[PDB]
Design a protein around this ligand. Structure first.
Ligand SMILES: Cc1cc2nc3c(=O)[nH]c(=O)nc-3n(C[C@H](O)[C@H](O)[C@H](O)COP(=O)(O)OP(=O)(O)OC[C@H]3O[C@@H](n4cnc5c(N)ncnc54)[C@H](O)[C@@H]3O)c2cc1C
Ligand SMILES: Cc1cc2nc3c(=O)[nH]c(=O)nc-3n(C[C@H](O)[C@H](O)[C@H](O)COP(=O)(O)OP(=O)(O)OC[C@H]3O[C@@H](n4cnc5c(N)ncnc54)[C@H](O)[C@@H]3O)c2cc1C
Lengths: 435, 436
């Protein structure tokens, strides 16, 4: 006699997927989303007359769970075509900027990346079972920086790879676990060309929101937005879920899909396992934010890295023309290096990277300040990947999903989808008995 | 429209099981009709010499996205056939001479030949799931695999190796085998030899292929009938009438055909299928393969052999060995016409030619090419076929088409069958579940 069979908390990819699995089994399913929008760490908006992506958007057929969903819903890819770069820049930690010939720039990053991931085959023969090998468990005592220091890289190569890794970390590279990066590279066919093809080449036709909506529509689930969950109590062979207006909703099972860094907001009765509590206390690393800048000048096709002590860590042309000028897409590794919502500070930093540009407008999303993310994409610290089963583990009638909890493409939309499929299976084991 | 079922799925291989699961979970009243007295189709697990053997498809990989996602859904891990040092690697040339090659050199040479064959896969197939995306792919579809092989400047050993390998993929001689199909598969495997090779015979599914088929059908809620071949489909009264071989008529809103392309001759269609689809049905797909296991008294250890296309034992691998057992060999025959796998004397003589001094204790075989419900083996495209694939995929009113042959990606695989089932489910939903 519960209100619902299953409640899914969070309406990102993990929650949408889990709700779709549950709904198609015939379970009375409710999804609760804290924000007034669906999508979570995916969010498409508009700036300077154009569509922009504030969070995750890029996918690939080597990412199996999301690719299969795209087949199911009939969604093709939209290509962001790869072109000759007009300009490739590196800013070092001291703020000096160097223009590198684009062919040399690309050659150097490839050298550094392949050196960093040289043992991916040996360490991750089964990238979807990250602790299969004793070598992977041993490497989880190391940071990415520990490895970088042994590679014999040139000054340019070291700055490039450190910038790239600080981006993946959303943090300084001394804090970033090594195995997580190797595992991702392994997921991409243990090959630089294939892996790199997964990063910013393809989006989904109709967008991420189209796929979220297709899954929720398919699910038949009830969906409530602007309803943050503040507590879960296990009681009467089910759960009592408390919302921020103090409404109580009862269910047989609850699937938590909220980002790991937001678990501090939620009371649990009884207490979660010690291992899970440890994860909730540490969180995941990333402190990233996303920024778009509209510049009067036509800069053409540009790319820049900035190393970790600087704010504009990844810069790419989103669009350009004589009429438009240039829209720059920028990813900030660490919120503390810049306030993306302070237009003067942004302008000064952009001008340091590109002397002579006039800034016409900015749009930003500070994922690290948003109470319903408190961080960006999933990134593991030293020693975390080894303990991941503690985060995955069911806690009675509370199940756990989200990209952080996936085994494969954990920094991605795909990992979220993966975790939702797992959650649906775990719900089915609790509700649909073998008889 | 008062039909017996909302949807009928014809065939209980991976494509049909997938399509039935997609339809069943939408709440459609779903029926699956399977001709054989078993499910699985071109996957079939059996037993020989005290052990489990695979007579058809069985090996999978996480680079194969549709099947991998299903394995996540149903909680199925992998079972590894471990890679070991090979004790022997042999090549048999077309004239029947056998050379034992150092395993390190044997592996080096096949890599050289394969990489040379697939050198342009990045350029030709930037989007392996959209095979006709590039003009170059459409141009290459005028060429056979052999046309390319002749231009590669391979050594005698390399040429025999790669020709044996390609004859296996073709289930035919390499002069008939379309080039783009092979390049596309390589592209699907991360455009990389090591990744692609890992997909071939490394991992099986925990609980077997039949466990996955059963998990999907159980999940579906669909009614399943075995030993019911369909002999005709007539579109009529806003739906279809399906005729079985006992002349029973079953009505439905929609039907999904998942039977192998080479078996379409057995089925009458009203109205007639499109000219494009008729052309495919007339040509069929290439493969004329069979599967064979041989139990040998001697312990041969871990062995591998290629035989070129004029010989019968084209792919040989140790399935198991020990002093007590002797050896069980797993053998794939590219073309039925080169040997009768069900004639034990002939098999024995061919095995002894490859391994002089062995005593054959028993054999088990499955002649896919003779089975009326496959009439061929794995999907393989002839010259110019890949270019026209949309004609085979295209819905014909309320009859939808699926099966591995009709997939865009891993067409020679379980994964392609799954892919085609997901598509069919979507097409069913568009016909049945209206926008209002
Ligand atoms: C800037 C950026 C760029 C990225 N780019 C890519 C990329 O290009 N490609 C890619 O594959 N991945 C990318 N990622 C990662 C990808 O977006 C994520 O891995 C994925 O979206 C995570 O999905 P999820 O469902 O696990 O979490 P989320 O999407 O965060 O969903 C969790 C949901 O829980 C809700 N919630 C939180 N607390 C509560 C509460 N108390 N009650 C109710 N609801 C609550 C949130 O509002 C949210 O909707 C990017 C990430 C970021 C931040
Ligand atoms: C020897 C062999 C080895 C292989 N190895 C691998 C491998 O290792 N890995 C891999 O991924 N792939 C492999 N494959 C390919 C893979 O098995 C197939 O691509 C896949 O199983 C095809 O699935 P399908 O559903 O399209 O067709 P099928 O499995 O052929 O299913 C079609 C079904 O339709 C039924 N049928 C036919 N006519 C009628 C009728 N008139 N009425 C009713 N039912 C009918 C058949 O009985 C059958 O059950 C192999 C194939 C073979 C033959």
């Amino acid at each position: 006699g519960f209100d619902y069979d299953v409640v899914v908390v969070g309406g990102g990819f993990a929650g949408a997927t889990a709700a779709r699995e549950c709904g198609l089994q015939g379970y009375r399913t409710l999804l609760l989303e804290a924000r007034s929008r669906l999508g979570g760490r995916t969010f498409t908006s508009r700036f300077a007359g154009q569509e922009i992506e504030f969070g995750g958007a890029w996918v690939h057929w080597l990412q199996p769970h999301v690719w299969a969903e795209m087949q199911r819903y009939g969604l093709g890819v939209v290509e962001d075509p790869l072109t000759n770069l007009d300009k490739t820049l590196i800013m070092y930690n001291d703020g000096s900027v160097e223009s590198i010939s684009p062919d040399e720039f690309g050659k150097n990053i490839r050298i550094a990346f392949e050196k960093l991931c040289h043992d991916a085959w040996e360490v991750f023969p089964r990238p979807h079972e990250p602790m299969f090998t004793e070598r992977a468990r041993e490497l989880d005592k190391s940071s990415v920086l520990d490895r970088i220091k042994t590679l014999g890289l040139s000054r340019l190569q070291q700055a490039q790879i450190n910038s790239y890794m600080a981006l993946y970390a959303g943090e300084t590279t001394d804090k970033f676990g090594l195995p997580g990066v190797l595992k991702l590279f392994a997921c991409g066919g243990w090959n630089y060309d294939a892996f790199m093809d997964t990063e910013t080449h393809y989006r989904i036709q109709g967008g991420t929101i189209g796929l979220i909506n297709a899954m929720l529509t398919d699910s038949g689930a009830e969906v409530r937005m602007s309803v943050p969950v503040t507590a879960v109590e296990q009681v009467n062979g089910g759960v009592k879920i408390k919302t921020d207006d103090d409404e109580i909703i009862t269910a047989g099972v609850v699937v938590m899909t909220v980002p790991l860094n937001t678990y501090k907001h939620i009371g649990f009765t009884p207490a979660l396992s010690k291992g899970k509590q440890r994860f909730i206390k540490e969180g995941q690393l990333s402190k990233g934010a996303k920024l778009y800048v509209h510049v009067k000048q036509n800069l053409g096709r540009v790319f820049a890295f900035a190393d970790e002590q600087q704010p504009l860590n990844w810069v790419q042309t989103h669009d350009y023309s004589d009429e438009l000028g240039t829209i720059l897409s920028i990813t900030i590794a660490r919120k503390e290096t810049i306030d993306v919502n302070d237009r003067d500070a942004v302008t000064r930093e952009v001008q340091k990277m590109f002397p002579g540009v006039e800034v016409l407008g900015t749009a930003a999303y500070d994922w690290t300040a948003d109470p319903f993310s408190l961080g960006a994409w999933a990134a593991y610290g030293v020693g975390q990947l080894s303990r991941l089963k503690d985060l995955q583990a069911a806690e009675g009638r509370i199940l756990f999903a989200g990209a952080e909890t996936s085994n494969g493409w954990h920094a991605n939309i795909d990992g979220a989808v993966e975790s939702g499929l797992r959650a649906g299976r775990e719900v089915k084991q609790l509700l649909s008995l073998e008889h």
